[PDB]
Design a binder for this molecule. Structure first.
Ligand SMILES: *[C@@H]1O[C@H](CO)[C@@H](O[C@@H]2O[C@H](CO)[C@@H](O)[C@H](O)[C@H]2NC(C)=O)[C@H](O)[C@H]1NC(C)=O
Ligand SMILES: *[C@@H]1O[C@H](CO)[C@@H](O[C@@H]2O[C@H](CO)[C@@H](O)[C@H](O)[C@H]2NC(C)=O)[C@H](O)[C@H]1NC(C)=O
Ligand SMILES: *[C@@H]1O[C@H](CO)[C@@H](O[C@@H]2O[C@H](CO)[C@@H](O)[C@H](O)[C@H]2NC(C)=O)[C@H](O)[C@H]1NC(C)=O
Ligand SMILES: *[C@@H]1O[C@H](CO)[C@@H](O[C@@H]2O[C@H](CO)[C@@H](O)[C@H](O)[C@H]2NC(C)=O)[C@H](O)[C@H]1NC(C)=O
Ligand SMILES: *[C@@H]1O[C@H](CO)[C@@H](O)[C@H](O)[C@H]1NC(C)=O
Ligand SMILES: *[C@@H]1O[C@H](CO)[C@@H](O)[C@H](O)[C@H]1NC(C)=O
Lengths: 290, 98, 48, 49
């Protein structure tokens, strides 16, 4: 239930569960928060109202992997979640070694709406360390997927049938560290414009772009990786693609004399957090507050 | 014509020159204002960071991507004059404080 | 206390009071005159 | 008493481009010139020229 165009009808099975992780989101260290769009703060405390998680809700593993046959239940909820107000994603870098050569590939994300060919779909796709982010009129297939370059499978990756280049609003390429362990992504929309944030290594998150669309996005989806993959019948490998919702909340961030966040506190988690946010300091004075 | 996405960038980037501070206008990166500029070296910018803000929410610095330079923004002059005037006089005594 | 009062009085210029923004530069240069009058009036009322 | 407070001029405009450039002069000045019988054609879109 992604696209409305028939592209392939081969190896289509019926059924062969999101693995809820026991870990929680950690705060007061930098994980979860993100830098401003293009503003810099030096040696100050900032009370900023943005889009963040609440208290460390459980994650959901939405990574889909196939070998020969595909499934129809995969293109349906709860795998096709709802982009309510924001998504914070944590991806594990699958580092493969072939002929003493390192390769790093992971899943592909597509946010937007149904959009057979009427409205834009923002797709971020990795190519051996090159993140291509394109917002165009791509026509999603009825059963899209993504094959892997190294150790290719028997199928062919085909998620769009646009023979001619359609109109676009933002197409760009970014470069990240090909020998990293974890990647962080942060997506949300507000006032009609959609923002993006990415982080290749480090606790905070870096800025990506902001695009004016005018319409409200509906759903996001992670495309499966039908290739020689995490299946441990031959080689051991693990894939973790955790996704957590967002919420409009006010945090308190700190900036040293250089401009890197050292610690970030909440304002609706504990009784001390409320006092810290009212006093706008991490070490408030002695007193009786309400 | 006058549609689509492909356009011509010839009526927006015309001057492409920053003065040494004359209390001029600016419409930088969406945010607009008025002020003077001063050349001050900065080593705290990054690849994705181009503007500098304070705790109150004003503009302090600005990094130009077309020249790889960093400038600081100073507010314009807006003050009053104290005029002491007697009963019958031609011109009062003016004073500009500070 | 005097410094905090002065800072709180100065900070009022960054509030919107229901308007589209807190700066008249991007208000008089974005919308037509006959529809920004209400925004300017709300800003003036708040500041007064 | 107040002063003059004249209106400043010579505004400064800056903006990061979203779409890349078309780069038509690179293809127009190629090292190979096609014959009038071939007349190779190239389409450009979603760019800035
Ligand atoms: C937009 O997408 C629709 C389907 O979502 C396309 O309609 C298909 O067109 C092909 C080619 O003529 C047909 O073989 C299919 O049967 C059509 N699908 C349906 C569901 O009818 C359409 O061509 C695309 N492009 C435009 C401009 O509408
Ligand atoms: C972003 O990177 C991708 C992949 O490196 C580029 O796609 C290549 O485009 C060239 C020119 O059309 C093709 O010859 C290659 O075959 C493409 N590679 C792949 C893997 O499809 C893309 O052009 C880059 N985008 C920008 C704006 O630089
Ligand atoms: C960061 O800000 C703090 C808070 O003002 C600075 O600490 C003060 O530094 C001045 C000298 O610059 C001293 O006179 C004060 O006694 C310090 N106060 C405290 C509470 O430590 C600190 O120097 C700043 N760091 C910089 C500018 O690098
Ligand atoms: C401004 O400075 C940056 C950083 O030094 C320059 O970016 C470098 O550009 C060269 C050539 O394209 C690359 O080899 C480097 O890898 C880039 N470094 C980084 C950190 O991105 C940029 O080119 C400079 N701009 C101008 C106009 O001189
Ligand atoms: C990538 O990560 C590795 C391991 O942490 C590190 O040694 C290397 O310097 C990093 N490269 C870049 C460009 O950050
Ligand atoms: C684009 O053309 C205009 C028109 O003369 C010119 O002012 C501007 O400098 C040009 N831009 C570049 C990057 O050459």
């Amino acid at each position: 239930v992604i696209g409305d165009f028939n592209c392939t009808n081969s190896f289509i099975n019926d059924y062969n569960i999101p693995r809820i992780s026991e870990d929680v989101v950690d705060v007061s260290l930098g994980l979860g928060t993100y830098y401003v769009l293009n503003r810099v703060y030096l040696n100050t405390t900032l009370l900023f109202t943005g889009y963040f998680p609440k208290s460390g809700a459980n994650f959901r593993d939405l990574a889909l992997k196939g070998s020969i046959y595909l499934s129809t239940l995969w293109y349906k909820p709860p795998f096709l979640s709802d982009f309510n107000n924001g998504i914070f994603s944590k991806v594990k870098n699958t580092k493969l070694y072939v002929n003493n050569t390192l390769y790093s590939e992971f899943s592909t994300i597509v946010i937007g709406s149904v959009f057979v060919n009427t409205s834009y779909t923002i797709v971020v796709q990795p190519h051996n360390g090159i993140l291509e982010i394109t917002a165009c009129q791509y026509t999603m297939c009825e059963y899209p997927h993504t094959v892997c370059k190294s150790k290719g499978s028997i199928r062919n990756e085909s998620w769009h049938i646009d023979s001619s280049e359609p109109l676009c609003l933002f197409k760009k390429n970014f470069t990240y560290n090909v020998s990293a362990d974890w990647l962080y992504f942060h997506f949300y929309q507000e006032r009609g414009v959609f923002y993006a944030y990415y982080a290749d290594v480090g606790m905070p998150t870096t800025f990506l772009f902001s695009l004016y669309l005018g319409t409200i996005l509906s759903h996001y989806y992670v495309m499966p990786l039908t290739c020689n993959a995490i299946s441990s019948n031959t080689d051991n490998e693990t894939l973790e693609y955790w996704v957590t919702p967002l919420s409009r909340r006010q945090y308190l961030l700190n900036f040293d004399e250089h401009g890197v966040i050292t610690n970030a506190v909440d304002c609706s988690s504990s009784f001390l957090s409320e006092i810290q946010c009212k006093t706008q300091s991490f070490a408030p004075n002695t007193g009786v507050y309400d | 014509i006058n549609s689509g996405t492909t356009c011509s960038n010839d009526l927006l980037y015309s001057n492409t020159e920053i003065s040494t501070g004359v209390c001029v206008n600016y419409d930088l990166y969406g945010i607009t204002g008025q002020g003077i500029f001063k050349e001050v070296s900065a080593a705290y910018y990054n690849n994705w960071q181009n503007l500098l803000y304070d705790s109150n929410g004003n503009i302090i610095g600005f990094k130009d991507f077309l020249t790889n330079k960093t400038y600081t923004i100073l507010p314009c002059y807006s003050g009053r004059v104290s005029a002491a005037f007697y009963q019958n006089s031609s011109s009062p005594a003016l004073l500009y404080r500070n | 206390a005097n410094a905090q009062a002065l800072n709180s009085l100065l900070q009022q210029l960054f509030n919107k009071f229901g308007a589209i923004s807190s700066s008249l530069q991007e208000i008089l240069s974005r919308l037509d005159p006959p529809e920004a009058q209400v925004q300017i009036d709300r800003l003036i009322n708040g500041r007064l | 008493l107040s002063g003059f407070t004249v209106k400043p001029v010579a505004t400064v405009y800056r903006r990061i481009p979203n779409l890349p450039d078309c780069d038509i002069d690179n293809w127009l000045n190629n090292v190979s010139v096609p014959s009038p019988l071939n007349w190779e054609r190239r389409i450009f879109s979603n760019c800035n020229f």
